[PDB]
Design a binder for this molecule. Structure first.
Ligand SMILES: *[C@@H]1O[C@H](CO)[C@@H](O[C@@H]2O[C@H](CO)[C@@H](O)[C@H](O)[C@H]2NC(C)=O)[C@H](O)[C@H]1NC(C)=O
Ligand SMILES: *[C@@H]1O[C@H](CO)[C@@H](O[C@@H]2O[C@H](CO)[C@@H](O)[C@H](O)[C@H]2NC(C)=O)[C@H](O)[C@H]1NC(C)=O
Ligand SMILES: *[C@@H]1O[C@H](CO)[C@@H](O[C@@H]2O[C@H](CO)[C@@H](O)[C@H](O)[C@H]2NC(C)=O)[C@H](O)[C@H]1NC(C)=O
Ligand SMILES: *[C@@H]1O[C@H](CO)[C@@H](O[C@@H]2O[C@H](CO)[C@@H](O)[C@H](O)[C@H]2NC(C)=O)[C@H](O)[C@H]1NC(C)=O
Ligand code: CLR
Ligand code: CLR
Ligand code: CLR
Ligand code: CLR
Ligand code: CLR
Ligand code: CLR
Ligand code: CLR
Ligand code: 9IG
Ligand code: 9IG
Ligand code: TCR
Ligand code: TCR
Ligand code: NAG
Ligand code: NAG
Ligand code: NAG
Ligand code: NAG
Ligand code: NAG
Ligand code: NAG
Ligand code: CA
Ligand code: CA
Ligand code: CA
Ligand code: CA
Ligand code: CA
Ligand code: CA
Ligand code: CA
Ligand code: CA
Lengths: 781, 781
């Protein structure tokens, strides 16, 4: 394989795949000359630390007598440069003896790779030969498919939980308008698809979805930047690694776009390529995910013991030395430099997360080998309970024992792989802060995601520790439309997702008391809308009331009429012996005064809240009383022109028969009219039979016409102090009053119709009383 | 490599990857023993025809002297079984000489593979060594990435156009509620993502998105089936191959789900695994995509010449013979059977689409080799214009010449590969019909998709040829919500996409004239909504018009009053010498009659449409005329009790000063009241100065009260035929009329206030005229 390698000899050989370089020289091969091996350029100190973690774990296993006694573990580790081609050359180097026996030391297991696409490409070849491959950083769900990848296992948790956690985070901060960026590889696309599913099931709308790569052209990056700028959303979920996101972040920094709230996947939430101070105005305040940190005692000293000459087995130490001190072995370096003197990710780390994954992968392979070594003859996992010979062990046997692995960590936790080869683990939630002393970016832990917890309780966040955009304490607004107040209702904007709405105020008569009201709820039948439609208020019920001032005035006038009638009646009764009261029919005078009292009592009926009996006894009472009084006047005129009682009885009986008829057929009834005024309910009365009202007033006015005619025929005659002209005057007053209020009765449907009726009754009764009796009162004085 | 192979020797060797089997055995090893090579189960006759197409193209090239003279093409073709593992074993067989020179005949180029995931896995290894790989059926966009796949080219069009075409088809048939199913591989996921993008830009809502596979468990298939059933959407877009869709179709057939409209991607739109008659109730009427058919003259005869013994180079002919006739060489077969006797996809084909792609790939490699062979010494593609030695040709040189390929087909078309190695091509659109004679499924061409055409013109469909569900001629309904009629407006349903809406009728005063009205438009102030709210009609304007019957009646009474006043005036002028008219002031009588004429003319003012001058000259005219009348009556009474003209002038001048004052300060104006009734606009008049109106009526009624008082003081006195009582009567009639209509003026704001005012004016004028002059007329007779 490649010349640059870390090789050690042993009984069992472990393969190693690490990204010692971030990527390869970006150039299009001309194919004019024979193509040579591409050279990867940017040194990755963190990847070299991962390689050192693998070597340290192997050395610790070799030193420990408890684990794999009398057996020596060796390694063959190559640099992938985050590239499929280099990893495939290394894998072809691994499977040389398998290829010879299908178409150099034998490779029992392989550790790696980092990238999910690289791991998929390597896993195809490795599972072709059933060589177990335990990856430390590849987290794509596509690798969980065991039909495709038979020998692939993971010490890193699967990516589905991370997308669910991002959806939970967006829900927690109450956002529904977000953008998505994904790396165009096996890491970005499945994760972003899972996030899209989880966001749509949480009613979260995604404005844009874009794909990026480290090989994206200038036009693609410009298009993505334009899409980001053109959007209102400021929360962008990014599923990518450092190298695949670096060009986009660089272009955003050049254009200097600030205000975006970045949600970071684990691959770049701790990336040194993205977390640099000069990008902090763009990427500051980023909220991202980190793996659970682990402890590897003695690892730091082993890292500090690195040396070009002393590390003879590790061939990558040469370039690490040359890149750390910028020397060559460009100034020549003696080799006596100090690692602690230079600040690189190699030593400048706080938590071991992927390095712990490498350590766990190596120890998992070692524990599988130990389970093979300690297998009791009749209790094996293979056919008939047989056990593999550790001296002549085969890769498929180690894979079989890895599928059944259960071992305790140095941290006292149980490591197991499921049917998909996944190792579930918690997440920590970090926020990108700026250091005051140094100015570098500090990853402050602000929360966690508990995968073991049930749905809805997995997320915990300390929002007080969060600095939005790196400096702000207020949660930013990332909704498409403002949640407008009550009294309004949401409405569709064509061609736009449901999260974006225009809210129109409620229609008159409909109320909305809730923010984000889908529709304006209607008020009930007896209620109406508020002034701003933020509530519902009872409809005002209106009629002619007793306590209201005008009803009081009408009642006082009715009582005054009753008092005057009683006064005249008392004057007549106490002084019945005088010739003046003897001239007129004093019995008929008493009956007429009683009729006037009944008339005023009937006038009292119209005032007040309408009721069934009240509307049933308003027209009939006045009709009876006024027919009776006109009949008494009629018999007085006929005397002027026993039997008089018979005539008044005949008239009152005809009128009361009419009344009984139309009260038996169709009683008047109280009804709550609601169509005249929307806000106001009019309590009024249905007559029931309108032709009955015609008959009633026709009879009253016909008896009136007869009385007026007979009084006119004898107007000039002086008798009983010429009462004929007074009768004529009272009756013409009756006709003036009742004709004059026809405009009043016409179309004035409200609380004032009862007032008009009361005033008409009072006027007619007062005119009759005055004309009949006030002349006699003047005579008596 | 694998023992079962098709091998021929030659100077230049072409690799071959074909799916002779549909898959592998479902033997998921428990790793009890050493895992053996997996056995392939279901024979694929169409894949064997593709392999025969490759062999036929190679043989035709060898026979043709024009193409590659004195050079013999050989092949090494293996069976992939649509599996990554076996394809990778074959690819490792291809790259043996490369692996020997990086860590058996040399492979110059490889044809294949079919599946996109298989092609990706093979292309990683092949591009590691820059061995050109021309695929005939893998259409994933992921393979267009030349950073990852350096040596990969395609004779099949890329899948982006097909997803765009499906979006265009959904738009054409007016659907917005569709479901999506995709194979969980490199073919299904990118295509379904492209379709999701193209549908979201076209306002198409996707109810569900599911993933399937040939290895999907029972629970996954049941979940997908329940998702399909639970959905209202009837159109389902499927990006999958036959084997990956077969379990889902089988389960849907078991449950007998009918009514769905399947949109088929090219991989399964012509699949024999899905297009079987016993599934026609479920998959009948499917609309799918096919590639351009090609012509390979002599191919059918070569296919019919297949034989186990005679085809010594083709090792796959043995199992083809055994599967075709169900024999062994299970009854023994002599080998003298006839291919045409048995109906298999091998010969029972109508159009060569993938076989033509295989043929084109072989001729593309051959033409690249020919371009190498005919290279002029100083005009090469390589360094310094050098040309490759065809005798010692290398794979990377052939790849370089393939990247620059221009050659003419046997059909007379130009074959070229772009920078991504893609060959663009048209699509045909087919519909799954049922044959009447045979009962098999017939793929009827119903349209095409022209990739060369501009956007919006690429799709052509003959809907008359389409049988929906296999039997129906009516386009099915696949919208989430009914597009309800006009008069209604759409409204949001919470938690649901914009395509699903509840439409509420428009509010009163608002109209929607369009289907799918986003909001109800309020039409202008003079308009009010229709009863259906489909439009809005003009607001009715209400006033007291001349043509109205009641306005006509009022005009007739006014004209009658004018006629009566003129008659009295004529009687007075013609007979001025009589003693009766000499007794009264004849000049004052003429003035009073003229004032009555002015009063009737003022009564005529209120009738008609209000106008600024009309509302300005309504109250003043009547006020001045009636005060002049009362002043003449006043001087007549004062005579009853020169200077009379002075008194009438004083009174009329006081009132005219009041009038000039309040028409100078604030004149009355015509206004269109729109608040009393929503549907109707009342045209009425603002007085302007209400206190000035108080002054006007106060002065008129005060001059009245003075006249009434003075006439009452001299009521009994007989003079001028005792005109005093008649004056008192006219004046009391004035007071009765004007007091009586106070209820009428109160709150009766409409077209009837002018009517009431006209009636009051007519009544007062008639009373005055009658009382003053009709007694004199009676005396004159
Ligand atoms: C942004 O929009 C979301 C969704 O409408 C709002 O979240 C809602 O908040 C209210 C009150 O807290 C809850 O009753 C709803 O259930 C939430 N809807 C969800 C979770 O879908 C959020 O408040 C908005 N943020 C703003 C306007 O700043
Ligand atoms: C994953 O995270 C959860 C929550 O942080 C851990 O549960 C906590 O465990 C500690 C002790 O280890 C308790 O004091 C807390 O009360 C627990 N919190 C809960 C249950 O909400 C859990 O142990 C973590 N798992 C791993 C494997 O680290
Ligand atoms: C289903 O809904 C779609 C909405 O997209 C309707 O298609 C629209 O029809 C109107 C007709 O006036 C066109 O103006 C729009 O341009 C169409 N929208 C498109 C094509 O996206 C379709 O008519 C509905 N089908 C029904 C109700 O059967
Ligand atoms: C793709 O399809 C279009 C339309 O079917 C083809 O254009 C047609 O070409 C024929 C001649 O070959 C003309 O008679 C038609 O009028 C054309 N139709 C158009 C322009 O709409 C086009 O040639 C096809 N491209 C191929 C086969 O490569
Ligand atoms: C009550 C409303 C609806 C109808 C009005 C009825 C009026 C117009 C009718 C009914 C009674 C009638 C009067 C009955 C008696 C007399 C006396 C007679 O010597 C002259 C006619 C005269 C003066 C009539 C005039 C018209 C009259 C007053
Ligand atoms: C509309 C109603 C309520 C109010 C009308 C009041 C009327 C009906 C009353 C009030 C004053 C009354 C007048 C008082 C004086 C006279 C003069 C006398 O020689 C004949 C009766 C006559 C003419 C009365 C007729 C009726 C009269 C005008
Ligand atoms: C002077 C002559 C006409 C006799 C007087 C009769 C008067 C008192 C009565 C008889 C008929 C009545 C009219 C009948 C119709 C209406 C329409 C109504 O919506 C308003 C009142 C109004 C306009 C009335 C006004 C007064 C009226 C004209
Ligand atoms: C109709 C409503 C508005 C008012 C009713 C009061 C009127 C009609 C009543 C109350 C007092 C009555 C007056 C009492 C005294 C006299 C004096 C007598 O020599 C002529 C009748 C006359 C003048 C009466 C006319 C009618 C009269 C004025
Ligand atoms: C229409 C507005 C002005 C209200 C009407 C006011 C009425 C109630 C006033 C104004 C003119 C007044 C009359 C003026 C003249 C007389 C004659 C006198 O010997 C007795 C009082 C009497 C009969 C007054 C009665 C009340 C009266 C009619
Ligand atoms: C009843 C006798 C003693 C007096 C008669 C006066 C009459 C003709 C006049 C004077 C004041 C007038 C009232 C003034 C106020 C209103 C309120 C209005 O919305 C309806 C008409 C109504 C109810 C009028 C009814 C008739 C009325 C009472
Ligand atoms: C104008 C509306 C109110 C209709 C009322 C008509 C009144 C105002 C007019 C019309 C005809 C007139 C009558 C004509 C004839 C006479 C006879 C005379 O000896 C007494 C006056 C008297 C009785 C007049 C009274 C007023 C009168 C009745
Ligand atoms: C005239 O003498 C009367 C005899 C009986 C009753 C009454 C009064 C109490 N009712 C006025 C009924 C009101 C009215 C008038 C005209 C048209 C419709 C309507 Cl609803 C008067
Ligand atoms: C009474 O003698 C008059 C002198 C001048 C004018 C008039 C008439 C033409 N105007 C009625 C004005 C109507 C009215 C009455 C009371 C309250 C409000 C309103 Cl709006 C009469
Ligand atoms: O699967 C993948 O592609 C990513 C690669 C990756 C992860 N975390 C990282 C940290 C540093 C460098 C690389 C990574 C998570 N899985
Ligand atoms: O890339 C892929 O996976 C599919 C495989 C495929 C296509 N068309 C076919 C016809 C028959 C059999 C298989 C196929 C289109 N591309
Ligand atoms: C974004 O808006 C700018 C300004 O008009 C425009 O130039 C650019 O094309 C837009 N991009 C997209 C993706 O709409
Ligand atoms: C970038 O934008 C910020 C505004 O947030 C501004 O303070 C800063 O000066 C800008 N930097 C450059 C180089 O323009
Ligand atoms: C591993 O062993 C522990 C006991 O030390 C046990 O609790 C745990 O369940 C085991 N793991 C599995 C997967 O059985
Ligand atoms: C379909 O709907 C039924 C009824 O609500 C429910 O029980 C079932 O779980 C649903 N299935 C799916 C796949 O959503
Ligand atoms: C399957 O469905 C079709 C169409 O609805 C119907 O004709 C047929 O009888 C059904 N068969 C069974 C077994 O339900
Ligand atoms: C291929 O050659 C033809 C002429 O034979 C020419 O028209 C066409 O443009 C060429 N294609 C390319 C890609 O150069
Ligand atoms: Ca790696
Ligand atoms: Ca050891
Ligand atoms: Ca990184
Ligand atoms: Ca949209
Ligand atoms: Ca294949
Ligand atoms: Ca030849
Ligand atoms: Ca198929
Ligand atoms: Ca939803």
């Amino acid at each position: 394989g490649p010349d640059q390698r870390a090789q050690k000899k042993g009984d069992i050989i472990l393969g190693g795949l690490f990204p010692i370089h971030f990527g390869v020289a970006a150039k299009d091969q001309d194919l004019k000359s024979r193509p040579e091996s591409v050279e990867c350029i940017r040194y990755n100190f963190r990847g070299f630390r991962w390689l050192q973690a693998m070597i340290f774990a192997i050395e610790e296993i070799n030193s420990s007598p408890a684990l794999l006694p009398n057996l020596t573990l060796g390694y063959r580790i190559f640099d992938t440069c985050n590239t499929v081609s280099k990893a495939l050359e290394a894998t072809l180097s691994f499977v040389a003896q398998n290829k010879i026996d299908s178409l150099i030391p034998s490779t029992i297991a392989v550790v790696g790779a980092t990238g999910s696409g690289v791991s998929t490409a390597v896993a195809n070849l490795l599972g072709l030969f059933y060589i177990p491959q335990v990856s430390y950083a590849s987290s794509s769900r596509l690798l969980s498919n065991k039909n495709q990848f038979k020998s692939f296992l993971r010490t890193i948790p699967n990516d589905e939980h991370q997308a669910t956690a991002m959806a939970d985070i967006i829900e927690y901060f109450r956002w529904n308008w977000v953008g998505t960026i994904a790396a165009d590889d096996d890491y970005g696309r499945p994760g972003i698809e899972k996030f899209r599913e989880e966001a749509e099931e949480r009613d979260i709308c995604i404005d844009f979805s874009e794909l990026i790569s480290q090989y994206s052209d200038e036009e693609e990056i410009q298009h993505v930047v334009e899409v980001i700028q053109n959007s209102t959303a400021k929360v962008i979920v990014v599923f990518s690694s450092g190298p695949d996101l670096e060009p986009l972040i660089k272009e955003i920094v050049r254009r200097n776009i600030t205000g975006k709230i970045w949600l970071a996947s684990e691959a770049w939430a701790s990336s040194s390529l993205i977390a640099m101070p000069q990008y902090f105005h763009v990427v500051g305040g980023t909220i991202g995910f980190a793996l659970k940190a682990g402890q590897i005692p003695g690892f730091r000293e082993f890292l500090k013991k690195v040396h070009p000459r002393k590390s003879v087995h590790n061939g990558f130490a040469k370039e690490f030395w040359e890149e750390t001190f910028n020397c060559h072995l460009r100034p020549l370096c003696t080799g006596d430099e100090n690692i602690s003197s230079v600040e690189t990710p190699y030593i400048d780390y706080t938590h071991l997360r992927i390095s712990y994954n490498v350590y766990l992968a190596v120890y998992s392979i070692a524990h599988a080998l130990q389970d093979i070594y300690t297998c009791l003859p009749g209790r094996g996992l293979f056919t008939n309970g047989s056990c593999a010979d550790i001296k002549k062990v085969e890769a498929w046997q180690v894979l079989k024992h890895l599928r059944h692995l259960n071992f305790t960590n140095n941290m006292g936790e149980q490591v197991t792989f499921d049917e998909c080869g996944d190792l579930v683990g918690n997440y920590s939630i970090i926020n990108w802060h700026l250091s005051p002393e140094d100015g570098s970016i500090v990853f402050k832990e602000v929360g966690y995601y508990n995968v073991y917890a049930k749905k809805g309780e997995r997320l915990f966040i300390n929002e007080e520790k969060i600095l939005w955009s790196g400096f702000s304490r207020e949660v930013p607004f990332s909704n498409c439309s403002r949640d407008c107040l009550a009294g309004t209702r949401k409405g569709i904007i064509e061609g736009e997702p449901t999260c974006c709405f225009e809210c129109v105020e409620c229609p008159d008569g409909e109320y909305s008391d809730e923010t984000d009201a889908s529709a304006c709820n209607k008020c009930p039948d007896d209620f109406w809308s508020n002034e701003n439609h933020t509530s519902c208020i009872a409809k005002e019920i209106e009629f002619l009331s007793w306590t209201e001032p005008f009803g009081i005035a009408l009642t006082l006038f009715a009582v005054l009429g009753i008092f005057l009638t009683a006064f005249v009646l008392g004057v007549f009764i106490k002084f019945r012996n005088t010739p003046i009261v003897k001239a007129t029919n004093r019995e008929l005078s008493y009956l007429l005064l009683f009729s006037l009292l009944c008339c005023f009592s009937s006038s009292l009926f119209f005032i007040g809240e309408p009721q069934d009996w009240t509307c049933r006894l308003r027209q009939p009472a006045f009709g009876i009383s006024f027919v009776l009084c006109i009949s008494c006047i009629l018999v007085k005129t006929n005397r002027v022109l026993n039997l008089q009682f018979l005539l008044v009885f005949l008239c009152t009986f005809m009128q009361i028969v009419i009344c009984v008829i139309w009260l038996y057929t169709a009683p008047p009834s109280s009804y709550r009219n609601q169509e005249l005024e929307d806000e106001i309910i009019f309590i009024t009365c249905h007559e029931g039979s309108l032709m009955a009202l015609g008959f009633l007033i026709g009879y009253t006015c016909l008896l009136a016409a007869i009385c007026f005619f007979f009084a006119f025929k004898s107007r000039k005659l002086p008798e009983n102090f010429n009462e004929a002209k007074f009768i004529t005057f009272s009756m013409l007053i009756f006709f003036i009053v009742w004709i004059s209020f026809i405009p009043a009765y016409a179309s004035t449907y409200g609380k004032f119709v009862s007032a008009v009726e009361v005033i008409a009754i009072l006027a007619a009764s007062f005119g009759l009383l005055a004309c009949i009796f006030f002349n006699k009162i003047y005579i008596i004085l």
